[PDB]
Design a protein around this ligand. Structure first.
Ligand code: NI
Length: 341
């Protein structure tokens, strides 16, 4: 049974609710972004209308084989009418194709569902700025003050300089980057660009990246591993055993691996600055964990909510424990009292 916080009252609508079978009274199923916890349940046999971004619709069609007739892509930043209700899709600053959804209810209520997002001050000048929002369905993944991490730009700077230094010192070093889903493509694209290489990867990964509308992509990626000095691998293979095994397969082209694991937050963030990060090393293999987040930090979240001034907040993440729920409700009340709404 679909939980309440995936339902949009006063509509026939659900958000990211594909694992519950046929939801009673749902006339249109919205998908915020192509991540498995959200899409769970979609497949080629789905016969209800799905509303999403153009990128998300590319992935539904090519990766999950949903039939075209049921995929309804919408342009961003544009007022659209779906089953007699006005909606707008906004960029979520999450993974490619990820959106927030504004719903304009027939009774005058205005609802924002953030899906998964990284709040940014640039959002304060989207179509949100022009009207009041009564209810906010909020991505609360890192809704606690201990969650700090750097900007995405500083993290990319760290990785570029790290990889460029290592490979200039040793031209026979291979760089490997871990991946398990879409998002965080900047990590491996930025590194390959500084090294003047393409990024090499499996045919299944190449296919997924071809759905994303990234400019000049045929110039940046490839399935020819032999021609590339930045390789992508499954995240599970980013360990000493997996990387040694991969270095065997490269046929004496390389004698050193430098690898990156983009994580979200890790407790080394409560002590260490990005500048100060060090790898784990064993022989000729080094592994850096880098805190490249596609979710709001605590401070970024607080600023967005205090700017938006919603009347009611409904969390969509960390909802399974009473301790988590109680913690989030405390911060929401603090924020409301400090800002005065
Ligand atoms: Ni996500």
């Amino acid at each position: 049974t679909c939980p309440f916080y995936k339902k949009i009252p006063g509509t026939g609508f659900t958000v990211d609710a594909f694992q519950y079978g046929v939801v009673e009274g749902c006339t249109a199923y919205f998908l915020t972004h192509f991540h498995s916890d959200h899409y769970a349940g979609l497949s080629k046999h789905f016969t209800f209308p799905v509303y999403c971004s153009e990128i998300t619709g590319n992935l539904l069609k090519n990766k999950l084989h949903v039939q075209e007739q049921y995929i309804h892509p919408l342009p961003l930043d544009t007022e659209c009418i779906v089953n007699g209700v006005k909606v707008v899709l906004l960029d979520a600053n999450h993974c490619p194709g990820a959106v927030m959804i504004l719903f304009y209810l027939p009774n005058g209520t205005v609802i924002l569902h953030t899906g998964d997002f990284r709040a940014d001050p640039s959002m304060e000048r989207s179509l949100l700025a022009d009207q009041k929002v009564h209810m906010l369905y909020l991505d609360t993944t890192y809704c606690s003050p201990e969650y700090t991490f750097p900007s995405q730009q500083e993290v990319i700077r760290f990785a570029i300089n790290t990889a460029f230094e290592a490979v200039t010192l040793n031209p026979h070093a291979l760089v490997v980057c871990g991946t398990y889903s879409i998002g965080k493509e900047k990590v491996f694209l930025a590194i390959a660009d500084v090294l003047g290489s393409k990024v090499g990867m499996s045919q299944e990964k190449y296919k997924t990246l071809q759905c994303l509308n990234i400019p000049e992509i045929n110039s940046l990626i490839t399935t020819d591993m032999c021609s590339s000095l930045v390789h992508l691998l499954p995240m599970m293979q980013i360990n000493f055993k997996g990387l040694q095994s991969h270095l065997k397969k490269c046929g004496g082209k390389y004698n050193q691996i430098l690898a990156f694991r983009p994580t979200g937050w890790t407790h080394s963030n409560k002590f260490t600055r990005i500048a100060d990060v060090i790898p784990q090393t064993k022989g000729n293999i080094s592994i850096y964990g880098i805190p490249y987040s596609e979710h709001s930090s605590y401070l970024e979240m607080k600023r967005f909510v205090q700017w938006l001034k919603p009347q009611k907040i409904i969390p969509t993440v960390n909802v399974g424990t009473w301790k988590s729920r109680s913690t989030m409700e405390k911060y929401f009340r603090e924020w409301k009292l400090e800002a005065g709404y």
